[PDB]
Amino acid sequence: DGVGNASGDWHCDSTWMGDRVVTKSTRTWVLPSYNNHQYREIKSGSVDGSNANAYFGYSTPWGYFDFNRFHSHWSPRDWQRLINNYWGFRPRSLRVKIFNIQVKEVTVQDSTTTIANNLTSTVQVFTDDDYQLPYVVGNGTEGCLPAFPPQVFTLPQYGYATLNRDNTENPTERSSFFCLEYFPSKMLRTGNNFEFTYNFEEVPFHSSFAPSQNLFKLANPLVDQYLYRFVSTNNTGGVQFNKNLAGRYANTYKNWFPGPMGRTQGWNLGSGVNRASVSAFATTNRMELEGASYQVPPQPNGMTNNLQGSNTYALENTMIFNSQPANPGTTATYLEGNMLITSESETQPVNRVAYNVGGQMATNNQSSTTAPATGTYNLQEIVPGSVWMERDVYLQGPIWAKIPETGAHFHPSPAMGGFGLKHPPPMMLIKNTPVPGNITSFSDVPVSSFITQYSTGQVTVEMEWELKKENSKRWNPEIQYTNNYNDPQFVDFAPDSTGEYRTTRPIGTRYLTRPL
Amino acid sequence: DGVGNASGDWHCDSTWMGDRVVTKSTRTWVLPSYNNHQYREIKSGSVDGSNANAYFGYSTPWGYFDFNRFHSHWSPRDWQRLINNYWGFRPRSLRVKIFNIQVKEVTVQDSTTTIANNLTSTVQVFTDDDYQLPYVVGNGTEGCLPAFPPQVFTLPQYGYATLNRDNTENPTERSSFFCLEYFPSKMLRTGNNFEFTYNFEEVPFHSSFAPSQNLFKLANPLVDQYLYRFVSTNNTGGVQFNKNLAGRYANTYKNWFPGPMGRTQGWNLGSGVNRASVSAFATTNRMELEGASYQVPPQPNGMTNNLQGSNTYALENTMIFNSQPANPGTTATYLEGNMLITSESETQPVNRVAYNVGGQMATNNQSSTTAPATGTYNLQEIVPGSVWMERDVYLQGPIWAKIPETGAHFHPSPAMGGFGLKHPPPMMLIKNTPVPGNITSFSDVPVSSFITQYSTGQVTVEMEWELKKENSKRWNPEIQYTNNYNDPQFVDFAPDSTGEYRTTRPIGTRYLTRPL
Amino acid sequence: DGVGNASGDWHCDSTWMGDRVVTKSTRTWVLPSYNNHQYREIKSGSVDGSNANAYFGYSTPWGYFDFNRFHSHWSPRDWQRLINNYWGFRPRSLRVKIFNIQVKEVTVQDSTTTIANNLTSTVQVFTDDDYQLPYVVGNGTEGCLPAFPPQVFTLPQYGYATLNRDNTENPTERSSFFCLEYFPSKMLRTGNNFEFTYNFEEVPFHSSFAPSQNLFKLANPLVDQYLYRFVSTNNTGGVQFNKNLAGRYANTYKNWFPGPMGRTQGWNLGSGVNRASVSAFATTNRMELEGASYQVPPQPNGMTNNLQGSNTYALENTMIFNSQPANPGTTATYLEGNMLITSESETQPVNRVAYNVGGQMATNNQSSTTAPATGTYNLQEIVPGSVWMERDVYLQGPIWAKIPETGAHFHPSPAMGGFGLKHPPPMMLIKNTPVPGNITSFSDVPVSSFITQYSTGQVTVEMEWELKKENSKRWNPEIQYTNNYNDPQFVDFAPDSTGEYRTTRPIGTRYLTRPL
C-alpha cells in the first residue's frame, strides 16, 4: 500500500504432499534500462564463416523473467528425493509474483556515481498470455532464476529475430515488428505488486525410469518360438528353415523396433584416442532450412550416446553444460574437465546409439548369378511399431518449450528435453518506464535525454507437480543418486571460500528401473 | 502502516503477579550486511596446536537474535527479588517482536561517508520453528541483548560448522549446506513489524535452594541404627561386628549416593600457592570424540568446586565470566581480578568436589597371606540411587539449550546451566535484502556490486516465568543476596563516568535453604 | 473344511500406504518329528576349554516359528525403498497363519523309503502369549523364514537351557522343567488352519539416519563463546585464562557427551597388518556372570567401529554374517571374503570408537612440586547428559528381542540390534502328534514305538510398520543405497545357476542424513 510497507514475503519452501509437490522459489532481480528506453533494429551477416548466423531482428528495452530451468525450483536435495522415488512428474500449476519493487537513480557527477532512489518512478509489467509475441523463453538461453537462492540475477534483455532476406541481414516484406508498449501493461510503483496464475495443460509424465530389460530381448530364454526363420539355401535353389531357439535373440521375430536415428560422430572423452587438430564444423550434422545449413544439436529423440562405461560419446548429440555461469560473449576454449557433459547412457536398451549404424537393408535382388548384398544405413526415421525413450531432463536443464504455430507437427517432444507445451507459461515482460530529463523547450522530435535508472526487487514462482509413484516388485536394491565423493576438497552443490555456488556434475532423472 | 508512524512501543517493564512473572525487555539492534550479501565457505585447520579446532562450515549474510542469557530479561533488582524468595522458576511463554525498522545507505564518496536512508529497502525475517537449521544459539556465544537497556547491540553473524573429514578442514560427503533463503521469510519495510509467540514445554523447575543438610548426615544423631557394620577380624579368621552408633556418620548405612564425578585439577585463587609457569592445556580434562580430543568445560553435573571459604577452585569446572564485553578476537591474558569466577560452593552437601577423589573400591581378594587393599578412583558415573544437584544459573548466564537430535540421551541438563529443551525457542534469523547498483548491461554471472547498507530497529522479548514459592518452617534468618560494599568508589550494576555498565560480581540463585 | 480344499492362499505381497506399510510373506515349512516324540534332558560340560559353555536344559519334540529377521518380511527392493526415504520405522501389528497342513508317513521297508500320507494324523499348534516358557526366539539363532520366498525351510527344534550348578552340567533345585503339552494347543488335521493376531506396544522408531553434524562441533565456527577456559599458569602459582574462539572445537564447552564405551581390540581387514598366529579368546572382552566369564559380542550400544574408509574394525563389536546358510555344527574357518562384516561407520559423529580410549581424567592433585598428570580410561558408562546412537538394523538381522523378567533394567535397546519389547510376539510352538504302532498287549510302560512321520505346510506372516517420513531442507543429494557392481558375474540378491539365493553384502538403514 505504502512505501514503508513490504508488499510480499520471502517464500522459498518446498512441500511434498503425497503424489503432489509445490516448490516455491523466491529470487532477487535487477533490471537495467536496456537500450536507453528505445527500440533498436539489430542485424548481422555471415559471421563465423557461415551464412546461417545472419539474422534480422529487434532488441527491446524490456527485460523478461525466464524461470525455464529445473534448478530454479528444485534444491539438489529435493531433486534427489524426486529422482529416486518417483517414475514420473509433470507440471500442473504455476504462480508468479513480482514484489518489493524499488527503482534507483544513478547520477554520475564529477566522477562520483550517486545511487539515490525516487518513490515516484514506475515499472510496467505485462504477461503475454495470448502468444502474440515471439516466445524466446524455451530455447536454452541464459538469464534465469539461479540455482542458489541468495544469488541476485539480472534480467535478460528481450530481443527476437524475425525473417531475413536471402540469408543476408536485410529484412523481408513478411518480417514483422512487435511493439511491446502496444500491449496493456501494469505500471507498478514501489508499493505495488504483480500476481499471476497459470494452469498447465495435460502433458504426459516424464518417463523417469531406466529400462530394466532390453527391447530385442523381451522373450523368455526358456521356451522357444513357434515361428521359423530363413537360414540358408541348399546346393540347388531351394530354401531351408530353422526354428527360433529360446536363448538366441539375434534371430527371433520382434514386435517392436527402436526409434529414429541419425548417425553422429563419436568422440572419445576421458583417456581418449581422438583425431588430432580438428576443426569439426564442416563434418558435423547439418540440416538445411530454406537457404543456409544449421547445426542441430541435440539430434531428435530416439537415440543415445555413451553405451556403458565407454569413454566414447556423441558430442553432437549430448547436452553439455558448464560448472559456473560465464561472461556474455566469451571465446574461451573449455575442456572435458570444466564442462558438465550429459550422458544418456541408461536409455540404451530402447534407443540405438548415435555413433553407429542402425542396421542394414537389402541392396540387390538375388539370383543364381548374384549373391545377396546388404548395406548399412546411417539414418532411419519413424517406422510403424517404433518405441523409443525421450531425452532425460536434468537439474541444470530446461523445463518446457513452445510448439511452433505451424499447421502440423509430429510427436512434440523437445529435442533439448522437457515438455512440449502448446500454450506455454506466458512470458513476463518488464521494463523501467522512461523518465525525461530537463526539457525546457518544445520540440517535435521525441525525447532522447532520460534520467538513467535501474530497478530491483524480488520475484517468487510457485510450481506444482503431479507425481507418478513407483510401483515395482523388484527384489534387489536399485541404483540411486548418492553424494559419493572420495574425501573432496569441497562440498558439492554448496558454496566455497569466495561464495561461488559450485555444481560439479549433472543430475539425471532415470535412476529407478522398470521392466518393458 | 506508514513511514511516519511508529510500529511499536518501548516495553521494558516487569510485572510480578503471584506465582507468575512477565519480564518485557526492549533493546535496539544494528544489522550490518555481513559477507556483502553472499554465502562463504569458512574452514580452518589445526590452529592453537590442536586438531580439535579444525572445522568446515558456512557463514551466512544473516544475523540472528540471541536473547539466551538471563540478564537480557532480568534487572539486577528483579533478579534479587527472585533469588531470595522463590525455590524455583521455569520459562512458560515467549513473545518476540521486531519493530521500528529503518534501513540506512552509507555512501563513501570523496573520503566522506554519507549515511542517508531509503524508505524502500526491505529486511526479511523468519523463525526456524521446525529446527531444520543448526541451532547455534544455546552454546554460550556473544551477541546477546545487553544487560543494560540503553546499550545498542549489533546482531551476530549466523554461521555454523558442519562435518569435516579426518580432522582436517576438508568437507565430507555427509556434510550438508543449508541455504537460508530456502526458508519462507517475511520482507519488512520501514512500516512493518514481526510478531512471534512461543509456548515452552514442561521442564522441571530450577532447584534454586541450598541444601540445609548433608547427604550422608540424614539420620538423627540421637537414636542409633538397627544395622551392624563389619569392623575387624580377630586373631583367627573370624569376623567381628559393631553397632552403628548415633552421632557417627562415617560408618552408618546410606540410602542415597552423590552424583557423577570426574576429577579435575584444583587451582588456588586469592592468596594462592600454585605451580609456577604453567601451560595447562596438556594436563586438562579431554574427551575424545571420533578423532581429536576436546576440552570439555564445565564437566558434567553432579560435582562442585570451592568447598567453603577455600581459595582452591576447579578452574576447569567453573563458569568464568568477564566484567565487561570484549573485542572479538582478543588474546589478552586476564587475571583473577578482572574475571567473574563462578563458585558452586553451596551444593557441597550433595555433590562431591572436583579436585579430590570420590572414594575407594577394593583392589584384591583377601586371604590369610593377603591384607585387603583399596584404591582411590578419579571418576564415578551414574549409580542407581544417586542424587546430585545441577549447576546454578546466573544473571550473566545462559537460559536454555537444545538437546541434539540423536536417538538417545540421558538426563538432559545442560552442563553450562539452565534448561534442556527438546524444541527450544526458534532462532530468529534476519538479514538485509540486497539492493543492486548500476547494472547497465546483461550478464549471466550474478550481481556482485550491491549498494552497501545496514539497518537498525528495536526488538522486544516478553518472557513468562512460573515460580515455585518458598514454603519453609525455618526459624533463624536465611542468607540472602545483598548490596554489601565497604564504601565503594562506584555503584555496582549501574554505569560510571564514561557510561559503561559495570558488573563486578556474579549472582547465583541458590540463596534460600531447604532440608533434604 | 475338507481334504480336497485349500485352507489358505499364497500371500507374499507388500503394500506401501502412506506412512504405513504391510509386508505379507508366505513360506513353506517342514516339521521333522524331533526326539521321536519325547522329552530329553540335554546337558554339557566345559567344552571348548571354557566352563562358560556348561549348561543344563531340555530338548522338546516341538518345533517353532522364528520369523525374527528382517529379510523374512522385506525383499531387497522393498528394503531399499525403506532405507532411502524414511527416517524411522517400527512394527505395529502382526498376523500369522499356518495353513495347508499335510502330514506324511515315511515307511522304510526292505531298503525302500515309501512316503505315503494319512488324512487322519493331526498337528497341534499353540502360541505362548503369557510368556510362561523360555522365549528362545530373540537371541540370534538359525531356523528362520528364508530371505527368498521359494526356499523351503525346516522348523528349528525347541530347546532351552535352565540353571546349572557350580558351572557344571548338573541341575540345581531352582532349575525348572516346562512341559509344553501342559499348554492348551489346537490339534489341526489336513483341512484346518491356525490364525493369530498381535498388536505391538509403543516402542521408539528406529533412528535410521546418519548424523550430518559432529557432536562436539555443534557451535557455529563464526561467533565465539562467552565462556572462558583455563589455559595455563604463570611463573608464579596464578592461573590464566583465554576466550573460547569460534572455529576451535577442541576446547569449547560442551552440553552433551557421547554414550557408553568399553575398549575392544581393533583388527585390520582388507589389506591389513595384523598380529600373526593369533588364538584370540584369552584376550577378548569377557563379562563374568555368577561363576564363569562370557564373551559378550557385540558390546553394548553407544560405540562404533570402522571410522571412515579404515580397514581397522572392532571384530569383537560388529555383527558378522554369512553369505549363505551353513550346516548345523560346522567348524570351518571362514575368511574376510566369505563373511558379511557389518560396519557401524556412519554413527561416528555421536559414538566413540571401540578400538581407542574415550578420553582422560585427572590422576593427581597438583601443587608446586607435582605437575598435573592424566590417564586414559578404557571404559566409561552412563553419564548424565549423554547421547548416543543405537546399533543399526540390517536386512539379515534380528527384528525384536525380549527384555528379561527381572525387576529392573536400564534403556532396553538390544545390543545385537532392533527393538526391545516387554511382551514380544508370542512363540508359535508346533509339533506332530504321536501315532502309536502295533501295540498288541497292555503294558504300564509308555509307548516308545511310534509311526515315524513328518508334516509340511505353508505359513504366512503379515507385519505392519509405521513410517517416520523424511522432512529435511538439505540442498545437495544424499548418499543412498544403490545396485553398484562393476560388471558382475552374477546378479546380487537373486539366484545363480544352481538356484542358490546369493547375498553378497549387508544392507544398513542409516543412509539419509539429519542435523543434530
Residue numbers in the entry:
A (entry chain A), B (entry chain A), C (entry chain A): 209 to 724
Paste lines from the article.
Adeno-associated viruses (AAVs) belong to the Dependoparvovirus genus within the Parvoviridae family. Because of the broad differences in their tissue tropism and transduction efficiency and the absence of pathology, AAVs are the promising vehicles for therapeutic gene delivery. Adeno-associated virus receptor (AAVR), which is a glycosylated protein containing five polycystic kidney disease (PKD) repeat domains in its extracellular portion, was recently identified as a key proteinaceous receptor for multiple AAV serotypes to employ the post-attachment events of viral entry. To dissect the divergent rules of engagements between multiple AAV serotypes with AAVR, we select two AAV serotypes, AAV1 and AAV5, and solve the atomic structures of their complexes with AAVR by cryo-EM.
Meanwhile, the AAV1 and AAV5 particles alone were treated under identical conditions to obtain the unbound structures to identify potential conformational shifts upon receptor binding. The cryo-EM micrographs indicate the presence of AAVR on the AAV1 and AAV5 capsids, but at distinct positions. The final resolutions of the cryo-EM reconstruction were estimated by the FSC 0.143 cutoff to be 3.07 Å for AAV1 alone, 3.30 Å for the AAV1-AAVR complex, 3.18 Å for AAV5 alone, and 3.18 Å for the AAV5-AAVR complex. However, the structures of AAV5 capsomers with and without PKD1 attached display strict structural homology with an r.m.s.d of 0.27 Å for all Cɑ atoms from 519 residues, indicating that no obvious structural shift occurs upon AAVR binding. In this region, the conformation of the βGH7-ɑGH8 loop in AAV5 is more extended than the βGH6-αGH6′ loop in AAV2 and the βGH4-αGH5 loop in AAV1. Particularly, this part on the AAV5 capsid has a remarkable larger loop region shadowing the SIA binding pocket. There are two SIA-binding sites found on the AAV5 capsid, but only site A play essential role for AAV5 transduction. Notably, the structures of site A on the AAV5 capsid and the corresponding regions on the AAV1 and AAV2 capsids display high similarities. AAV5 is distinct among the dependent parvoviruses, since it was originally isolated from a patient sample instead of from laboratory stocks of adenovirus and has unique sequence and biochemical features.
